[PDB]
Amino acid sequence: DTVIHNFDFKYLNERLGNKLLSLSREQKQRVNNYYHSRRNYKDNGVVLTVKYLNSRDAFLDALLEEYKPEARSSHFILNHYLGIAESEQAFVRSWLSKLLASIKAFISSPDNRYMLSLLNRTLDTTRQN
């Protein structure tokens, strides 16, 4: 239900009428049953665990002070060694703490083997610090 990222289906329904086909409730139920038969998580014991992570400022600060043990303050470590301007510090502390908390929870898990972070920026050589 977006027109930036999709066709306007309010306009298409006005203009095409019933030439805009739609699979019905019975058909959707049949497709739902078919998809369940191929992805039967519940009868086989697959569990989906969801966490919502906010900023972890103390956790990030402890990690930064471990990264550079003899530096003075974690704000200084962020500025100098990571290369973050004074404007970007709060934003980076926000998006970095969540990423690192998720990574730590992934690693400490016993048998998960394959993580995929999805950020907005790429972590290529332009952000090597």
């Binding site: 400022d57 600060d61 003075r72 303050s73 974690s74 704000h75 200084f76």
Partner: peptide, 8 residues
């Protein structure tokens, strides 16, 4: 109340 920002 961040001591790390008070230091700078």
């Amino acid at each position: 109340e961040s001591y790390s920002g008070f230091q700078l």
